[model samples]
Target chain A: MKRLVFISKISGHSLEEIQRIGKVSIKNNQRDNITGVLLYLQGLFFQILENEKVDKLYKKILVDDRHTNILCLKTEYDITDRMFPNWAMKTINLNENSELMIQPIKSLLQTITQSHRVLEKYMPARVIYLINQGINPLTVEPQLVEKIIFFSDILAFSTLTEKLPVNEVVILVNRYFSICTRIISAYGGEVTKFIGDCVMASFTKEQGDAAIRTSLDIISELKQLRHHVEATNPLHLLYTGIGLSYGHVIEGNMGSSLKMDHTLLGDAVNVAARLEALTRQLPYALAFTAGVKKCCQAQWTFINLGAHQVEAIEVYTVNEAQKYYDTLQITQLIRQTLE
Target chain B: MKRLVFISKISGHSLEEIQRIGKVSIKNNQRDNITGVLLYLQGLFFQILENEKVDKLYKKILVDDRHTNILCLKTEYDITDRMFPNWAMKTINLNENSELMIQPIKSLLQTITQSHRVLEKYMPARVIYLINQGINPLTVEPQLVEKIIFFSDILAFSTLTEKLPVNEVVILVNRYFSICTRIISAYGGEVTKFIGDCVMASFTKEQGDAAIRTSLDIISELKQLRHHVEATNPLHLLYTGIGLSYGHVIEGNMGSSLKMDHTLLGDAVNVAARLEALTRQLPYALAFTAGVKKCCQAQWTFINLGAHQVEAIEVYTVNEAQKYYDTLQITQLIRQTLE
Candidate 1:
């Protein structure tokens, strides 16, 4: 299944017309067994749809006269969960200062579409920050703290095929996270969140060395599983790229009441994700920052890319070292059972 | 003893100036044992300070060259918990689209201060709604639910004097809420939140009869509480006004992760608050919406609010009847315990 989250500006309509459109959309979606949320705020319609036929629904949305300048923020498949699980199609109309809060946001939308380059990554984060501050003005402000942040995701997550048994595919995915989750936790590092193929974890300020060792252990465990498992099995294809960054990060509880995350939010967290994205840029797959380099006790076997170092980011593939947080035999058994 | 939440526009500052101001404020606040969060976003200074001397600190802030056009959103005393309890002071700077996202909000601020009438109640709520949608675009969109919302607060809570032992005051406050809370829960109503002296609860659809009976039982319980207690006791001063509204309320997990509230939002929630506020304007102590009136089984001594009722609001003193969710003896026992 695919889940698509998108934002668009309405060409316009009366409050009555918006209600009419909402009812019709709900009826149509109910018939299709589609679950989603449609929110009309000022002149913007932010919607998320979950279904196998989302591509068809989105294509239909493109031809509608009501909304234009659509921006697809995220389109991903293998959604284990739907955001609006129970709602056939829920609609919320938050037309606050309706005509007034209207002008700036729509103009902002047009200006954004004109220069789509800087719009993608920066839009959602800042917008979320502003909104959280407004409603939860009394919320514990994001506090800067020294922590070692790590991110890793399966390299072939989006490459899954129907040729593989869907049930086996999920087990293969779950097995990798279980391996990483146990490794990180056993090392006293907190596995902060796991979303689909990605896992983010952090350690207290001093344990940059411990975090590095944990990541290396994960990579080594996965490598062993792939070599031992047959080529026909999807587990053979499960390799993850790891990124680690160390420094002051704005750490706080974020998201909303229904789903909040006690997570890291700062430039350092972004740097971690960016380095993970660049892991395939190298022959070996672990990447990291200079801040983490300062804590290294192992003999240095790192390839420093000089250009990205303007931010002083230096990612490395470990020819490195560690202590056993968990036995490698634990991961070895999962592969054995699956075999 | 007090908690103050306020927003202000800075007079002038580079990023350097904001940081400098933050440092000095943190130093001064720490020395006075003040705890709060200070946020600098797009040229606005948002701060919440908790101290016995916050009034003095605010007075000093009024004279600061760094900020002007300060608006005190809420100033309430007898705060049981500090929002940022451990922090001496924490500061975060979110200067996103610094020059662009900056313009619309500030102009909106100045326009808002020009007509401070609508600004007080509406500003925080709408601003919060916008931010939550932007970040948690996938959060369960606020659904308009058919619910019976009940709000009640002690009439003379703010008249608390220092001659009364502060510890005893809190216990007295706790007693009334315990009375109301038990009554609410016994009838299957959920007390969504209790903010200081005020309590708000909601019943599942078709529970108007249950909620009304609960309120009367609470009032009857408190009435016996005062008659039996000593005249000089603070319990003698504890009378409550009630507000009940029945209709479609925007129900969602509003607020942030640090302090999210699964509460009612939209016009019905506001009408609930307004009705509670107007209980004093009537000879009786209960106010309600006409939507609730349709469910009435009792002979109402209701006063028709013709003017506020273009939306059709009605309020009553309840020359009415009910089943006991709990015995009035429970509240009477609290007075006995105090004696």
Candidate 2:
């Protein structure tokens, strides 16, 4: 069997929902011949999973939106037996003695931090010694990969939270994230983090079209949700602007020895935020950077928003996106009856 | 086989967690010879479960903290075959044409609303007509029961929300509710509703001791969570106060046909709220009314807060609750190494 260990911070509208995810995870894991133990303490998750097809399952977990900042600590291909064979998944509650359980992982994290600091702070004459030994220590290569960065922020969220009861405001936030997360996950994208009322999601190069499709689905889903909320409670009116960008990014786990944050850092993530901010001033609810349009082969209407800033990067909006979706036979059938 | 149908609002830290719960439920159900389908839309959950031991499973569900506001829509002892037999549990997503799937349930709810309204609005005329036909309409009795009403609110919640980022505030809220919900559910209490930062939970008369135990457990859990956040992010400090009252209350689903609120209403709920509010001025983190003291069988320290005006009602505080919890062996085991 193969094993993969990863940790992430839980994200949800509520905590019960987080536990419920654990309950569901076990069931899915059991069906897939996977065995694991999940430890949750102070909002952090530490899980070790074992299966014959560990990487396949790991990929599935990567796109899961319930948790963010997932860092793969280790993967081992040869395992004689499951650590937790009888139990599909077990939750280990923390107690006074439970520190022993976390010590191993913490020590691993510490090693990484020390290595990073040494790499950053020291200029070693040993570099020449290592080069002579057929190892190049000075030329460190950071992993570079292409991804579709999606950013979204609720329109006038602060105003809404202030005007409405906090409970109502929370419920609205839950609904928004729940819908967005589902659509994004369905399209093979992962929601990396939620910054206040804004959401950051990403898709692999293979899911470029899927990212755009997710945006369209979100718009459609939002319309339905808005109508339902209006009918049920007129006090709430929620809207969001979304932006997508496709480009290369540096992806890795970055943090101190005590803590780690699995994140993407590059120009792509920044440009995506700019596009989303631009949506506030534009007429469209969705905007895309030129890089995304270049890879998007889907026959969808695009309205060029002209060159933006000194670099002359072009931006575009999906013209009548809803209308374009309405033309699809599946969407037409869905819209006809739901409305 | 017997069957029961229930609908509840999903409450969790996130949407993925809520769905994870469904996945877990099916595995447990299969082992217990229970079958069901859970339909989630917006934030509501509608599930129909069937088993030879229906009430047994239903009772287990009642204590589940992942979701709340459970309403039993129907119970049948004469189920011929399961509505979903081949599958242990299945999730049915609602789509454009899926309105038909819920039509029957909606109509049933509509009928109940009309009946409730007629009973409330008209007094004698219909009573006499039904009496002549041997139906005792006038003698129609509402379910009366004794319950423990528990109310809790975060101290300086508004200040916390204002001082912190909305994202951080939201995360804090999720942790607070998640911890409280789990302990309450473990002790057989139901978290009925969330009113802003405050939560209203309840216990059946039989669970009198369980309610107190739940409160004690919550206090212990909070200490651990507080230590964690303080160590991680000292800028965000969260504290909460709790109050409990035990007495009779009217329990039912009360609302128009279009919507429903599964809730408890009476003097007991008011008294509990008052006691919780009183915690703000008192040194203690937990407070209780005379009603709770009268029914509590456990030996614990309490301090009289003296009688209040307008009806001789007395309130008391759990003296040195934190110190008291610290003395417990299990708590000592959990807090010592964790801290």
Candidate 3:
């Protein structure tokens, strides 16, 4: 469903008028299963209304004399997830008293005003609830941790999708990534993102075995998918190479102060990324650094390691050996570059 | 030292001339303890020179007759790491013949031409090496996994830094986050990112205890930091709240076709974030959900559970729990919201 987001200048009305308007919204909004958040920052009112029926409500909002200069940010836009489900009509009225929250709020407004594409990282629904209740969200701190990082990307994605129409490009990407998400989920892994033709996912360090097998399955399943359809169907061209590495990674909500993204970074991620690229240099379809094969001890675990180290670190490859690795005999064929 | 990055249009010179320029750079760059990459697209030269002496070499580049429209992208900028060490001057002469790599490379060129700020998601130095060697980077695939997600952010950051000068804001953010990075690393975790005033980190399932301890230490340490300085120092205002959760997470390289970022997402991340906000509603400084506390059982584990659930999930917290939790007797007080 598309979430309706817009900002309007509050008419010359007293603060209590907004207080009165807010309750009316609350009383009427939930009846239509409409959930939203409305914030009055000084003389402006920014409201995000969510639900299929939001279009009708927006028309009603247009007639209201409480606001003017209604600038709709995103209308009828596709959204797979909803972030304000619990808030029926959370309304926050902020002023000088909310110095603790004002700057970030202003930052958010400026970000949106400057670029309509500034999505993600807004105050949480509960945050406004608390703000209305006279409280601020928690202060933020930073943290560090280690995990297994994985990357899988379609080969020759640029070449493959280059000439296709945008709609076809969209269709192919979604179809191929859909397979990736399902299989990754099947293996108890959650995909973190779809970067063009690449899908990066994270796993617990202990999930190394799961991570590796998942990679192999991706290659095999993609090939099978290539076969399952007629040649006329673009699926036949689907192919992917995978890389896995386990090491320290940085985690945080990032980007400029105006916008933020939840992301992970560090050497391990880049290694897995480079190793995935390394797969193209060789005939193998998959690769992995030496980290958890011993811990997982799966048969046919190791593949041929030739030419040399990847990104200066020795790597293992697959294709079920030719397409995948030969198991067992490969407990420690490469140096523990990190150790 | 800053890496010198610049793009210059070819002055109608033969491709071999740039190739010639590349080799001279290779031999001379190494002698100067410098390294970088050079790419000769159809009609341009985009080069990155790394080393403290690169500034001097850039001056040489500016006078070269073989190029025109010399535009320096980044100069005298701070960079702690380098990605093109193996290639003092890894040069690629790309043209229509290299159809496989051209589109993405063109996408890359267009991206940069459009935005000077288009950083990250450049062709990997290794990919360019392979491209020059008549190879393309591997096809990318996707993966998934479960992880223990963690987040910490300073509460009231907006209020605290709102009035401070930008320089002081920078100092506070860096110092507070530096402490976070240090303490998290001291606990054997790697810092993922610094998002505005928040820090997000990822840990292995087994490191759940490590993740929790890191949070407590951050809260305590920041308080200690507040005390370690005089009232005149702004450190006294530094405070943070933390949240942790274990579940599936999405990992990937993301953004528009122009730029990409490595990041993580899903319910687990948002849950931890909301719980962190919950900390401000109450007086606690740290919070976590049930996941692996039993796996890595520790003393005084459970904290106070008051008003209600956070984002509909049962959460555990600390400061010691009213400065810390009273020991073990409080194991299963909250409902397992996810379960």
Candidate 4:
């Protein structure tokens, strides 16, 4: 079954408004059994429909002269069938000039987004990021952690948000985040959180080097998912780097009084995070640390950046060692000046 | 394909309130790819899960003390690969209070009933009645109604709704009305209007017959879908009276030069509505005019309501036919009073 998706531009109308529009659009396309998120920002309406005729249906909408400045950013999967069928047209009033339309749409969108977050958490991880920085990578017991994965999330999430509704922005973030998580989980990984747009995840080494390999695979998946999402929604397609490392970290629920849930903390966790942060300084769309390259069996170029004075710990880059080994060594030499 | 369902008691809440709750539940369960509905009413919660482990999960939920009034309506059908994949569940709010829940529940329940009404028309037909009583069913050719189907919907509807939220009273109504249109379109019917507590529909002839049969079957299917919805939400069921008739009339765009697209009018249309009103006095759950019964090739018992003066057409009744027939024979023998 096709899933309901919400796709829209990155910045424009609020997420709430986009969702309202999406809710109506999905409702109108009632015959189509798809559900997801709806994003409306500026003049773009990004929506996802899982119906059999989504492609054909959208083709018509693409040329519809009634709607202009059409930008599509985010689309969510419809978790359930539609609610209103008689109207045959589910609509969210983007123009709040009328109080009548604004009230119900606003309330419904609010209720929906809140529950969506809770659902996203339990979903299987889709993508993985391996942040390899130090000489060693983080590793842990599988049974204790249930699942561990890596994430290289970008910071300043609030700054990246456009005029899109706050809820829509959250939903867009969640959609991409889920895509990444889905790939990771598909390869037997678990996700932790998002550092802005950057991601964070850790995995146990109990399955040998499966977690490490899975992390690399997720980077490729992210690019694919993003490419698809961007074509549908004109949302900004910012690419982030993913690094891989393995070692050890305490994993389980940890909270003082108010909150207690799954989390990881330890030196290995710190190094994994540091490498993720360090990748921003590297010149690549996706890269890994020298320590992570050792476990990779996939065919890929590897350049080694010798140990350097990294944040709290030394950081290294792994590229095509044969192609850029000299430059990598010299970069390490450059790091000595900062040291 | 598994269909998630819900059965819940209405308690004292309105249908919209219960639907809101159902929406929240769907969002929460979505990550597991669970897709269904929220159904609640007076004192029941029927939740159906399509996942393979649904039975095990149902057992887990059943033991919970929070779910007090429980009824596992249908235990058959392993619907995992059904049409809607994300349909995590169906939550129904069953209410014995007002009659609001009747139409919505009937729309879905009709599918499992003996009625030959096409399953697709069930939603739209019921929804039409929930919103207004003016709309009639007709088997329409898509080519004739294509424009109306596409660009005919009014844009600023929310403004019109603000003044009339809860403006109608007197009959049992609920979100089942929402389902009414869904059932119709589900079976390939269309919704024309939803004024007050009544709903109206435009359908193809064959499709309309199917819609009527579906509405009649609601009593039984309600028994089945309720079990599933009850597990997760309040159990709300809609009891309904269905009337059927057919004829040609003026069907065209009416409104005004400024706005309006598709509209229908004529004696045939009026008679169709009158038949619906007769449901109140009819004996069977569904009462169809003799003409319609023959026209639809429907199998049902009927009585000749001796010719009587009535508006639009002659009146007839299938109620208490055995006694009425025997008594009529004797009355004809001593009909001197007719002079």
Candidate 5:
């Protein structure tokens, strides 16, 4: 039940060899879905493995003498999420540590910090990750759940990619995520992951108006920071729309033997993403769907982006998504290019 | 005019007197705003100094009978921004030579690999910093600019202070700022300075779509890195927003007797910060004014959030902000109170 992740530092390492070793671990475990991560940077390897029998795999990994410097970044009974789900080991070349790699690590790391150590450390990761017979979630009771999900993305990403270097773009993109992380978390929201140019996070419905108010608060607070910045520089007002959706995302960590990741995949997840995309087309600062409005009869005026179909979501594209997407695209292209 | 920033490790034998001497020199130069950040740890002083006349300051700092050992951790010219402003001297205290202080320096050290004369060359600090400036933003042309501005923040920063020991928090904050520097420079964006929980940056509108897309793209990508972090954890996703408002203000060398920095300040600068804030409440994946949309045209689909007043400009609030905030609040509360 314990999900294990291995962190190893290898020098002058080859990527192919890493894959081979990772696969061997999975085969030996006889765990069909065991997935883990292997990072090779400056000849060092850092891995996060998830599986049903993670403890068994970890025990085996601890003694493996293949690498001179072998250390476990994190090992615990409950592994909630599998970073790599399909392959036994996901060999990531940290030479170009993608924003993706960093963001999720940052997220999970937060949960790790909150977990109880000595006895039940990494419980948060385990709870979020659905490990079979592993650590139980803090609660198993059926209670009224009012979960708010937010989704956003950059506009005209394809065209921009051609114009920008991947690394430069990655750095800029990460800044956006960082801002989102700071604001949402400050308001008590937990950032799950960034979809692309878009970011995803959520809060609880029981929070009443706190979530909405806090979101608004961040918006205003950001401006204050702007005021503090020196004057006479090119204004790079990065505007985004937030699509909010309400639903129950079976929040848990899930994966096979090695690859595991905490997921917020659900119908509502799709809806939130869609709404964020849809809002792009709207002419508003904040867009909301009927469901979101129902929960928080916000004082601010709401604009109806009508309804439309979004990618992967069969249901109506929430108004919020439409506006978010459109705004990202138009503003992105013009400001970044022409100004 | 060119701006520069320098971070170095100095011996702290007569550092106090040396500092006073340096302060006097700054005062003589009428650079009251110029200050050196000092960190005393392991019997060493880690110093970061900023000014237009670094040469004179550096000479004075170097000749002073202060510390026995010295190493320029970082020396960057044409630095896009400054961490402290209007102060002649500001010092930061560090308790340990922890990773918090090492990461930024280490990262800087790593970048030299691209150059032929790396550590082995042992060049003058001025030359080293000059190389750094050249190394970055190699082609900071209009086309390379991604998104109009860059934004970032410390993660769970509030909790970081409350949860960790005071001394540790200081070290941690330094470490965190180093990360911010890495991310900013990686994207070709200039590093500004740190705010309470935020950092600021401005990009050329010329890079146009490339810049815009890159900023958003980075956020989505970092989502993976952000996964493990928790609200109360020492680390959390630095939620940030990339608002693209196109307009050139000024990005060049700035200095008087007191200070010299590469700062981008203008009305547009304020707009960029406000734009980032909009992400907190605006519902679209992105938001834009009519001006930005006109340029991009068919490349984007915009949802009119109707007309509403934003901080600097009168704009519409798309429904996206509402939905996202609504969902995240409840979800966060649910996870926090329950867990």
Candidate 6:
């Protein structure tokens, strides 16, 4: 038997439909005596296949139109054992508990960058940075830490997923995340974890201004990009609610003994989530706790939402405050930064 | 080649991990020159395998501990054309656009119920009802219709999905839906569609009170059931926002040319969705248009949310309204009828 691993850019397909393709692949692989695993992250497909007929299988994969720019990273002939012997094909969905899979992923990344030219172009610098910056989801021990926590959720995203094909959902999620990563990274915030349609990030207390600014940029960018995404797929529209809080949180890896992930716990994180939930109740697309407001030294606008007892938290929104901040100017500034 | 089909109750495994098992099955099947398809729904697994050595494989499957109560559905020998020739094994995830696969499913259901006594006991009535009620999602045509549309979305559900394993998510989603279905059905509302983490339902104008009542029941039932589900898996919590609108809607099958669904459209559906979205902005668990409130003759309580300019719409909630209607009595009346 031999092992073959490759990566490809997903195009014109939904993430939900990736499983559809996986279904087909599993069925075919079973008959072909091929065993392997498929991993999809952000917008790329990383797959490993082990079979006696690796050459013939690779030839078929090359002609498959579902993906583009397919690049082989490595192939080993005369293997004694299968890495994923049990699975004809398995999808390693990278969630919080999937840290066990990351070691192999890290090794795969290093090999690809070191050996393959075509794949080098397909690999994003952000992914490399994300991995290199000690992003191991495992090994995070629980610790009480102080930082600004930011949370955002796609508005009506579940509705979109329902209306669109599985493939389209994948595309939209990737596009939305890419836009988010670009803006959040620009503000120097590390996206710590993605909770399904929700994104959780953190920064030093001093970077509260950038955190708030990033939220504003998100709204502006979403408004600009939503129309384009809608035109392409009219059934689903993109909108998001963003919330921020600052204080001490129990940050650590939590999961069953079999799998664990790095995440935040405690009132600060809870209130931030509630504030994001609070966005569904308000007409605004953004909200934050008073703690985040106090730390916002940047000249950003905010609307008072008063205090509430449900969680006994004060929330605020980006103030049109009699249109104090010129919306166009801020959007243009964001555009300039992106360029 | 010979063919074998069977169904079993999944035990001690995650639905997400089914693909893992599929991987192993495909690899082995390829070496053994077998081909088949697997379908998973609720907690049941239905699979069909085609190979020359059918009896030997059946013996192995009977002892596979991942599932139990395996019963053979059918076996065919000396086939000329393969049902799934390319696939070593395939998984058919039954979703909205998957109606085309139902003819076989219908046949499968009949065979299992008619021939197998033990397996029939494991099949739930809800699955049977869900399938029988014109659930073939493939043949919907566009048409205008009038109904009271209600929409509800799970709060932070995506976050829960991010933290939980694939199997746990499957379990949680099913539990949530079961609760929603029970309450909705009691209130004379039919759940028309589920959009990811959101649920959409409808009722006649005369059933307006039942629709509102259903929302309240959802809150109560969720609060009661939340703790148990959390105790089992603390990472994911259950909370939802409900919204309603009474108006004419463009209801029909809509999708890409190849596939469509039995769903509702028009401004009424959109506004109801917006109202559900509005729940994230408010402190309440439910919201509805003034149209629904006007049609309510049940002396139910409502808090006026004032009129908004976006659609010249008025919203209301179940508030104390200077007189809190005895919510308990009405719920009991609903419970009586259900019994």
- Candidate 3 CAPRI assessment class: incorrect
Output the lDDT of residue A244, model 2: 87
Best model per TM-score: 6
| Best-performing candidate as measured by lDDT | 6
Which candidate, 2 or 6, has the higher lDDT? 6
Can you list the residue pairs that collide in candidate 2?
A12-B13, A12-B14, A13-B13, A13-B14, A14-B12, A14-B13, A15-B13, A17-B12, A17-B13
In model 5, chain B matches the true chain B with a TM-score of 0.45
lDDT of 3 by residue, A50-118 (tens): 445776787789888778755454343567766467777776554533453223223233322322111
TM-score of chain B in each prediction:
0.50, 0.58, 0.54, 0.38, 0.45, 0.53
lDDT of 5 by residue, B205-324 (tens): 444444445554545444544466665544443344445555534342222111122334333555656666665555543444544443342343345655544434544322322333
Between candidates 2 and 4, name the one with more favorable TM-score.
2
What is the lDDT of every predicted structure here? 0.59, 0.58, 0.57, 0.39, 0.45, 0.60
DockQ score of each predicted structure, in the order shown: 0.01, 0.01, 0.02, 0.01, 0.01, 0.04
User: Residue B311 in candidate 4 has what lDDT?
Assistant: 30
Q: What would the per-residue lDDT of candidate 4 be over residues A244-294, giving only the tens digit for each residue? A: 556544343221111112344433444555556555556543444444545
Q: TM-score per candidate, in order?
A: 0.29, 0.34, 0.33, 0.28, 0.30, 0.37
Off by over 4 Å in 2: A1-339, B1-75, B79-142, B230-236, B322-339
* Candidate 4 runs further than 4 Å off: A1-149, A155-159, A206-236, A256-258, A286-291, A298-300, A309-339, B1-339
Clashing pairs in 1: A131-B131, A309-A312, B309-B312
Q: How much of the real interface does each model capture, measured as fnat?
A: 0.00, 0.00, 0.00, 0.00, 0.00, 0.00
Interface RMSD over true interface Cα atoms for each candidate? 20.0, 27.9, 15.8, 24.7, 21.7, 18.5
- Please report the candidate that would top DockQ against the real structure: 6
Question: After TM-score superposition, what is the CA distance of residue B275 in candidate 1 from its true location, in Å?
Answer: 46
